[PDB]
Symmetry: C5
Subunit: 103 residues, 5 copies
Amino acid sequence: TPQNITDLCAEYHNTQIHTLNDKIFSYTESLAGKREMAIITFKNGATFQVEVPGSQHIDSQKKAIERMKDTLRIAYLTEAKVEKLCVWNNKTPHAIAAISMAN
Amino acid sequence: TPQNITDLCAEYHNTQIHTLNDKIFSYTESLAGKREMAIITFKNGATFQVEVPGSQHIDSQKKAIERMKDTLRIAYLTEAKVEKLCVWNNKTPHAIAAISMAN
Amino acid sequence: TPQNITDLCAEYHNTQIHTLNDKIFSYTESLAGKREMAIITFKNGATFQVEVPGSQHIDSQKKAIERMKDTLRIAYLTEAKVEKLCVWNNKTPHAIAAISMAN
Amino acid sequence: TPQNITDLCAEYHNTQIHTLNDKIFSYTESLAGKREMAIITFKNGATFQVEVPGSQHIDSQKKAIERMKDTLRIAYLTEAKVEKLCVWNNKTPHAIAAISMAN
Amino acid sequence: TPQNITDLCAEYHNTQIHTLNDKIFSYTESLAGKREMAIITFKNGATFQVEVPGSQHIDSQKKAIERMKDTLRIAYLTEAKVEKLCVWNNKTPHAIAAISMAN
Ligand SMILES: CC(=O)N[C@@H]1[C@@H](O[C@@H]2O[C@@H](C)[C@@H](O)[C@@H](O)[C@@H]2O)[C@H](O[C@@H]2O[C@H](CO)[C@H](O)[C@H](O[C@H]3O[C@H](CO)[C@H](O)[C@H](O)[C@H]3NC(C)=O)[C@H]2O[C@@H]2O[C@@H](C)[C@@H](O)[C@@H](O)[C@@H]2O)[C@@H](CO)O[C@@H]1O
Ligand SMILES: CC(=O)N[C@@H]1[C@@H](O[C@@H]2O[C@@H](C)[C@@H](O)[C@@H](O)[C@@H]2O)[C@H](O[C@@H]2O[C@H](CO)[C@H](O)[C@H](O[C@H]3O[C@H](CO)[C@H](O)[C@H](O)[C@H]3NC(C)=O)[C@H]2O[C@@H]2O[C@@H](C)[C@@H](O)[C@@H](O)[C@@H]2O)[C@@H](CO)O[C@@H]1O
Ligand SMILES: CC(=O)N[C@@H]1[C@@H](O[C@@H]2O[C@@H](C)[C@@H](O)[C@@H](O)[C@@H]2O)[C@H](O[C@@H]2O[C@H](CO)[C@H](O)[C@H](O[C@H]3O[C@H](CO)[C@H](O)[C@H](O)[C@H]3NC(C)=O)[C@H]2O[C@@H]2O[C@@H](C)[C@@H](O)[C@@H](O)[C@@H]2O)[C@@H](CO)O[C@@H]1O
Ligand SMILES: CC(=O)N[C@@H]1[C@@H](O[C@@H]2O[C@@H](C)[C@@H](O)[C@@H](O)[C@@H]2O)[C@H](O[C@@H]2O[C@H](CO)[C@H](O)[C@H](O[C@H]3O[C@H](CO)[C@H](O)[C@H](O)[C@H]3NC(C)=O)[C@H]2O[C@@H]2O[C@@H](C)[C@@H](O)[C@@H](O)[C@@H]2O)[C@@H](CO)O[C@@H]1O
Ligand SMILES: OC[C@H]1O[C@@H](O)[C@H](O)[C@@H](O)[C@H]1O
Ligand SMILES: OC[C@H]1O[C@@H](O)[C@H](O)[C@@H](O)[C@H]1O
Ligand SMILES: OC[C@H]1O[C@@H](O)[C@H](O)[C@@H](O)[C@H]1O
Ligand code: NA
């Protein structure tokens, strides 16, 4: 079991760590059918998605997907610094797999 | 996959972007039968709803509809600036499909 | 579809609006059996309830009832001004059908 | 329907009101199997639990038990003043039936 | 029924108490498949997980696992002092069973 985001991220193919150390600049969420997703940006232009739940997801991921959107909204509203994101780099925008918050 | 609200909104019919760049002026929520909904207004008079779930919605939207009402409530209470809303313009008041927040 | 709480309230018999323009003074919550409910009071003012779900609540209302209790709690804690309540006024304390928040 | 915690508490057997008029001193929660519970304390030594869901609960009470733990956590974190607790006094620690909050 | 985290922790095998008396230094969470977990750290290097839900958990522990991740996230954001953790010491990082917050 990994003990940090960077080691977690290394367990997966097509992932990488983005180091932001910054608050979220914008938070966008949609309820439109087939686009039940969130999108975040940082002021450097970095853009990330929480993907719409789908066949690339297993059942254990559904609750975690909803939690991640919860986390992004509250981080946004509190202006919490995001340390790192583990993202899938084979999607545009890159898709979030994990987040770390630290000063 | 869209990277912002404007591109997402353009994937649907009968939708438009309203640019508010303002906090929500009032938040109304109802539990009354057949009107289980939320209504928001802005100081310019713009009024929007999250629709009562109905025949126009699918199962994959159910959680997202509940999430949007959560997001509007906490945006209202915290005075969070709403950047844009994507809305269906064939409902009165216009019905929210997506929101973006940015300072 | 109504665009404000007053018009919504006018769609139902046995309701009225109370105009409060004040924060909630006290919040009471019970998990005791058959009293799973929330009660709010306004300073030097009235008490209101969210009814226990039962016979006279249809099924889409169950989530809305839970949401309303969540709304009253967060309003109380954040000290947000309640603008108006739409209530059923056939018993004391009057039962909440809808809430509006505005400054 | 009772309009305050004291009158609510009087509808049950083996309950009583403790008056605190104080913030929560400590908050404890557990996910250990068969001990999925919460405990709170006050600086006068008063200690209360939210019981593990069990045979003594009817099914409407499950959501309410979860709500109470939500309430106690955010009360603790925000240092919200707890006015009174209605508790079952046939358990150690006394088990929470209801709470009232007032500043 | 225990009245505190230490006595709760002593009801189980392979558990121990870590006394921190400090805020959380970092909070990490993941939606990646088979690693739907949270990780927290403290400035002294202590690292703890909320385990991926699995065969070692009963249904009552499921909601409690989700609650604990909620608790850790808001504790982190609010700089809440964590008093103690009860953890399983047969997992690496040690796996949280219970938390207490005080002071
Ligand atoms: C809306 C938009 O188009 N914005 C882009 C940025 O891309 C968006 O955000 C990124 C994170 C992805 O989600 C994109 O899909 C999304 O459109 C764009 O950022 C660069 O995007 C690249 C996409 O492949 C890549 O992620 C890149 O970073 C990696 O590659 C660069 C070299 O180009 C460096 O080697 C980086 O170190 C490397 N990072 C990692 C973790 O491997 C992104 O660029 C990096 O992030 C930017 C936010 C910015 O800080 C860059 O200096 C940095 O290199 C940027 C590119 O400038 O433009 C638009 O803002
Ligand atoms: C409670 C009430 O009746 N309030 C009205 C506004 O209508 C409400 O809010 C709007 C946003 C919709 O949700 C309505 O269903 C709702 O009742 C009303 O706003 C205008 O509403 C029009 C629909 O009836 C329409 O949406 C219009 O915007 C479009 O058309 C205008 C012409 O008026 C312009 O061409 C706009 O560019 C165009 N916008 C887009 C994105 O397509 C709304 O008017 C605009 O928004 C207003 C809030 C205000 O800023 C206007 O200056 C602006 O044009 C307003 C209209 O005055 O009156 C009450 O406030
Ligand atoms: C961890 C621990 O053991 N703490 C105890 C206190 O007990 C804990 O908290 C109480 C509220 C219960 O939930 C217990 O289950 C729990 O372990 C203990 O408080 C007294 O607890 C009694 C029950 O064991 C009882 O509730 C008592 O108050 C009642 O009785 C007294 C005299 O015995 C008076 O009649 C009170 O009016 C009566 N209260 C009511 C509402 O009927 C508790 O003591 C009262 O509250 C204490 C917090 C404190 O302010 C006392 O001065 C006050 O009498 C205390 C006190 O013995 O010891 C440990 O802190
Ligand atoms: C990322 C990393 O490698 N970090 C390690 C610490 O381990 C992490 O945190 C601990 C709490 C566990 O969850 C690990 O699984 C996790 O990787 C590491 O902490 C020590 O970890 C040991 C188990 O691997 C063990 O728990 C130890 O505590 C016990 O043994 C020590 C002496 O080594 C003392 O006797 C303690 O009293 C005893 N504790 C109990 C409750 O029985 C951990 O060390 C303790 O906690 C540290 C955070 C630090 O304050 C030490 O002074 C203290 O002894 C530390 C060890 O330095 O290194 C990395 O930070
Ligand atoms: O998914 C919700 C949407 O469904 C469409 O059919 C309708 O025209 C929109 O106004 C909106 O209700
Ligand atoms: O509903 C929960 C309650 O159930 C009662 O029967 C019991 O006597 C109380 O102590 C409390 O457990
Ligand atoms: O309930 C969860 C616990 O299950 C036990 O069997 C195991 O020893 C612990 O590591 C922990 O996973
Ligand atoms: Na009416």
